[PDB]
Ligand binder design. Structure first.
Ligand SMILES: Oc1ccc2c(c1)sc1nncn12
Lengths: 195, 198
């Protein structure tokens, strides 16, 4: 049950689709980036059409909507990666087992494109190209994280197995989210850009 | 997709169901266990009915069935754990970030044994304060596998020149597999808990 904005895949399950500059989809995603990254040059934006990653994400999304009994569990975040990790993330998504981990041993997602735009995350390749994903993240109900977490803390010490969905640096004004489970993040767009 | 032999859960998402000796379900697990663990005695066997884990598991199984060529992708395997781990596993399954380092390491992931005897070692199924040991019977998507290596944090590529086309799991020995390692969430469904004692 594959989204509208996706384009036909000739019965295949995976495709990177280069967006057309000037059209609505490219303009929406470019504007999310340029809010904090208007000094960088965008070379291209690719929609990630990964049927498997999508299915697994959508299943986790329906589970978290039931669990939390409301539907505001999704946020759009950024993730800066090096050139070598791009093929893996496109095909297999984010992997905590693969950078400071101050708020737990999960995958890190930035609210601001500027945070992910740092060279330590979006590592320039030899040609100077940087890579950042626009990611759908199931942040759900979150709390402050701390070093050493391997899962989010429980929502009550009385019930140790009922967990928060993610952790953040700051609950009132978050700038990053950590998630600790595969398939809590769908990599939706890859931005190729330069300094 | 909840299987029709599961007990009704009255719109609940999790339930442990104690099995009865003399039923085929209990007896087939007992026989699988006693095959290599005849010196131990089973206290009880519970069916694990976790709606969410089962759904995420079945999605990965259908994905691996499409990906691989008519492969038998799923094995029934054993997992020894400590009493402190049973509530997390029952509710959230098997988390590689919590895995113990195995005495013979074939990668940094969750280990599953062919033989109950392996899982029955006190190192895995640690005796609780009452002398009870705990072993899961687990549906595992082993898929297409190769000999593992201690450095692995994911299964290796089938081909070094295509680094993203991966083996599903690794084993200690591909001619005679005794353990499997899996590197991803929802690639194992904890189906039964065996409580046993000396
Ligand atoms: O401590 C970290 C580690 C990784 C990381 C961040 C903070 S923000 C970000 N965007 N992409 C990757 N990352």
């Amino acid at each position: 049950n594959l989204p509208e904005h996706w384009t036909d895949m000739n019965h295949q399950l995976f495709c990177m689709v280069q967006l057309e500059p000037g059209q609505s989809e490219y303009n929406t995603i470019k504007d999310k980036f340029t809010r904090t990254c208007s000094s960088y040059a965008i070379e291209k934006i690719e929609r990630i059409q990964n049927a498997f990653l999508w299915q697994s994400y959508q299943v986790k999304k329906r589970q978290m909507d039931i669990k939390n009994d409301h539907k505001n569990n999704e946020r759009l975040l950024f993730h800066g990666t090096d050139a070598d990790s791009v093929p893996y993330v496109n095909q297999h998504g984010f992997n905590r087992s693969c950078n400071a981990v101050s708020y737990g041993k999960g995958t890190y997602f930035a609210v601001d494109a500027s945070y992910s735009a740092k060279d330590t995350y979006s590592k320039p390749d030899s040609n100077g190209r940087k890579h950042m994903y626009v990611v759908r993240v199931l942040t759900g109900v979150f709390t402050k994280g701390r070093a050493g977490l391997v899962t989010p803390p429980p929502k009550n010490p009385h019930n140790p197995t009922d967990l928060f969905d993610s952790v953040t640096n700051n609950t009132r004004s978050p700038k990053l989210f950590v998630v600790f489970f595969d398939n809590q993040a769908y990599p939706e767009y890859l931005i190729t850009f330069t300094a």
